[PDB]
Each structure stands twice: as C-alpha cells, then as structure tokens.
C-alpha cells in the first residue's frame, strides 16, 4: 500500500522509457544488428499484455470492459501462437537465430570473405538487387556488413520454410570507385 503504487509507477515509467528507446531506435536508425532490442522488448510485452488483459478480465468494471479485455487477451494469444509457429517453422530448417525476427518468412544467406551472412529478409521477388556503396553492401534493404564490389558472390541462397531458392548473378555494373549495382535471379529451386 502507498509505497507499492509508487514502485508500480516508477517501474511503469522506466519500462515505458525502454519501450521508447527500443521503438525509436534499433530498427529505423541505420539498420545495424541490434534487433535483439526489439526482440527482447517484444518477448517482455507479450506476457505483459497477457497478464494485464487477464487481470482486467478477472476484476472488471462492467461486462463490456470484461469482453474487451477477453478479446484483447485472445488477440495477444493468437498473435503469440502465430509468431511461434512461423518462427519455429523457420528454425528446424535453418540454423540461424534470425528466424526469431518478429515477422520473417525468408532468410538471405550471402557469402563473402569465406563466411556466409544471414539476414532476416522480409520479402523477395524473383530477382533481388545488390547495391554496394563504398565499403558497404545492402541486399534487399538489409545492411550486409562491409563487402567490396569485385568480391561479390555469383550465387546466394534464400531459405523459405518449404523450399530453398538459389539466386545467381545475372547482371552487374559499377559507377564509383568501388560502388556498384547487381541483379540476381533464380535459376534452381530446391525442395526441402
């Protein structure tokens, strides 16, 4: 009592400050690899929303508030089950933790420097596009580290939950000192 609601208010303001920091930064700042922020805040906010909706349904103001709290509890349960199903279906096939991105049905593997780099791609067409700008590579809107234009792979893979699609370097061009563009297209799909 008294001090309890003060600690509750302090905790709510603090966690809303972390939600403030994680929403305005991380994804829409420069798109580096700190996406675990949004992951850890979303994993905190799924059972938090579940607990608040359950506690509002247990002690309701009226019947309409009870049915609204039950509706949002069922909606949060449905979206959590959908996220776990769509992320588990992409983890038994690929050994990458980027399948735990909040919305991801494809993973882009790009090999350079003797290593493949996996990024949680959101949607690909039948012909993806690589853009090298100085010492930096961007492929379908994802920051793929640093990679020179001349050392660009002629084969990349994208791993859907039911198929593996192989893309090969169909077109390429260079305009700067080491900056250029490239167009990859599918040539062979592999059934998982």
């Amino acid at each position: 009592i008294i001090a309890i609601i003060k600690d509750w208010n302090f905790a709510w303001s603090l966690i809303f400050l972390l939600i403030t920091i994680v929403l305005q930064y991380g994804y829409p700042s420069r798109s580096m690899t700190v996406y675990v922020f949004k992951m850890f805040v979303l994993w905190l906010l799924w059972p938090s929303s579940m607990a608040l909706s359950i506690f509002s349904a247990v002690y309701p103001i009226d019947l309409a508030s009870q049915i609204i709290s039950g509706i949002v509890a069922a909606v949060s349960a449905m979206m959590w089950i959908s996220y776990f199903v769509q992320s588990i279906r992409l983890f038994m096939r690929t050994g990458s933790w980027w399948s735990f991105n909040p919305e991801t049905n494809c993973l882009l593997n790009v090999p350079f420097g003797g290593t493949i780099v996996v990024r949680p791609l959101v949607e690909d067409s039948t012909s993806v596009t690589a853009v090298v700008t100085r010492g930096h590579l961007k492929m379908a809107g994802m920051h793929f580290g640093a990679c020179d234009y001349d050392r660009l792979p002629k084969e990349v893979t994208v791993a859907k939950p039911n198929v593996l699609i192989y893309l090969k370097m169909v077109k390429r061009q260079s305009y700067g000192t080491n900056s250029g563009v490239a167009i990859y297209s599918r040539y062979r799909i592999g059934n998982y």
Partner: antibody
Amino acid sequence: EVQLQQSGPELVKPGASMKISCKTSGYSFTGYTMNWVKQSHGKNLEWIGLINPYNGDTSYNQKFKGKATLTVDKSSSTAYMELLSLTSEDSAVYYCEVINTYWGQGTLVTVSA
Amino acid sequence: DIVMTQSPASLAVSLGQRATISCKASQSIDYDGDNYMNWYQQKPGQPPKLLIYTTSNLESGIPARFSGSGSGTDFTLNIHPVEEGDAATYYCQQNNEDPYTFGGGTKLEIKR
C-alpha cells in the same frame, strides 16, 4: 577464373570404391554449391546430388541414395565424392558443376575385369 | 519423377535454315509463375555448356542464336541462323523438382 579440375581416368574392379576429386580454384570455395552429374553410354545424362561446402547439407537422387556419397574437404578446396558398389552399369563420365555453368573436365571410370 | 521425351532425335539443317528442337515434360514444372527448364549444349569430348536458364533467359557470353522460349508443357529451342560451328547435342532439364531429370538427345548435324 573459376576452374574445377578432376582426377582422371580409372579402371575399377566390381565391388570396389573409387574416390573422385574436384579441386576448385579461383574463388572463395565455401559458400557456393557443388553438384554432380553422371553421363553414361554417350547420350544419357543423370543427376546424383548436391552438397553445400559450408554445411554437410546434401540432397541425393532416388537412384543414388546408397550408391554415392558426397564429401567436402575445406582445406585444399576439394569436393570428394566416392562411389559404392561399382557394378557394370557404372562405366561412365562424372562431372562437377557449381552454378550450372562452370563444369568439370570429366572423370571417366571403367568397370571391367 | 519427371519424364522428358523430346520429339526430334537427329536434325539435318543447313547454314541459313531453321533448326527446332521440341522438348516435352511429363507434368508441370511451374513454381511461382516460372517454369524451370534449362537447355545445355554438349560437344563430343567436352562437358555440357549451359545455353538457356529459366525457359527464356540467356547465358552471359553465349550468342543469341539459341533463344527459343516455349511455355507450359512445350519447350522448343530454336536456332534460326544456324552457324557451321553447331554440331553438338542439346539437352533439356528441369531445375524445379527433386531429381532434376535431364532430357534425351538431339544430334544436330550441319548440311553441306
């Protein structure tokens, strides 16, 4: 500058096991996908399987599930397919390929006594 | 699996004449609106050379004599000018299913 070199012609006895090398060069070897193709009697092209140099991810043909294994040695950049139970129908040429473009020179194996 | 029985087996055309290799399929090889069918050219004593990617696109560094497209369950490769250096064998494939079955054989022989 991508070039795959194979081993060479080999006579094998029935029931033996011949290992076919494919020493790739001129590119970053780990990250592409090797792929093996068997050509028999002059005009009969068949598919065997592919293998990722990064993982051990293979996918064989239905007629080559127990007749072929694919291996990757990531020190000298070599694909290391060996064959099992070399019967009289295996006298054939064998090819590596990467992106369906850069093929190999072709290893000829003859099964005879 | 996929069964490919291409109707020609030995074509005898001349320089300037029309060459057409008609290749078939057992069922559809369509995925995401694209029918995956490769075309290869193999000379005697040589590995196969990839001519055609997904039905319509061209190999880089290959000439544009071989550009027959086809669609559905009918895939024809057309050589319209027919140069002298074309005595080879042309092969179908499907880069869609699991077995990746090749085609039959078409020995194209230049008339003189």
